[PDB]
Ligand binder design. Structure first.
Ligand SMILES: [Zn+2]
Ligand SMILES: [Zn+2]
Ligand SMILES: [Zn+2]
Length: 244
């Protein structure tokens, strides 16, 4: 997903996803200790810096190839042979964040948490869970799709307190893998012969530009909502694990 501005949701789908996940935690009055949301807000600048940094600098964006931002659950690889993927990378920052949290280094802790949340968010994007890049056929579709998402994302907010609490085990890799599995199952709802043909025709036809956008909207909504619920459960796991 996009992460265009450090502290604005406008063209930053990643931040939007995290903010909506936090809202789910706030809405829950049965099992969530609200002081956890207070801490995320206290160190929000750092959390957002981490969410943004993943797509802007090394080592996070791998020399502008973004290889660590992809993860196919069926073969466990990213799109570049031998490169690090999103599962191991997301888990890495989940643990670094937690160790810093226990050591009372809050800025370090929430910066790393933000990075981890970014990688978890990415595997929820079907293209990232299936190694479909902006160079994949049809080339240019990946970037156009993620920019389009920003124009409609705010219409798919989860409005209840039902995050996926204890969705997977205590291992963050299990959560990232699990999210990638669902995202890949949903891949054909975004990338198929129809959306491919229409995207290409959109080059010279406004009608087809609107056609592929409409076609991918329902599944986009599903992916954004699942992303919110999974992220909420993931944050809860982090505090349950490292929260004193
Ligand atoms: Zn992304
Ligand atoms: Zn992308
Ligand atoms: Zn990314």
């Amino acid at each position: 997903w996009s992460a265009g501005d450090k502290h604005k949701e406008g063209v930053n789908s990643h931040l939007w996803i995290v903010n909506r996940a936090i809202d789910i935690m706030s809405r829950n009055t049965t099992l969530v200790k609200q002081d956890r949301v207070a801490q995320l807000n206290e160190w929000r600048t750092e959390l957002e810096n981490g969410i943004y940094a993943a797509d802007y600098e090394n080592p996070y964006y791998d020399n502008s190839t973004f290889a660590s931002h992809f993860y196919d659950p069926d073969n466990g690889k990213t799109y570049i042979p031998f490169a690090k993927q999103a599962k191991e990378t997301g888990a890495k920052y989940f643990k670094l964040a937690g160790e810093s949290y226990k050591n009372k280094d809050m800025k370090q802790a929430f910066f790393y948490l933000g990075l981890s949340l970014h990688y978890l968010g990415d595997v929820n994007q079907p293209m990232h869970a299936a190694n479909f890049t902006n160079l994949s056929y049809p080339q240019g579709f990946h970037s156009k799709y993620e920019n389009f998402v920003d124009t409609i994302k705010d219409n798919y907010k989860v409005t209840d307190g039902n995050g996926y609490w204890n969705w997977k085990g205590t291992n963050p890799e299990e959560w990232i893998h699990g999210a990638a599995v669902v995202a890949k199952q949903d891949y054909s709802g975004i990338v198929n012969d129809n959306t491919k043909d229409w995207f290409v025709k959109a080059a010279v036809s406004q009608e087809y530009a609107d056609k592929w956008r409409a076609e991918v909207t329902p599944m986009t909504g599903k992916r954004l909502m699942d992303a919110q619920r999974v992220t909420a459960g993931y944050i809860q796991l982090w505090f349950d694990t490292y929260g004193d």
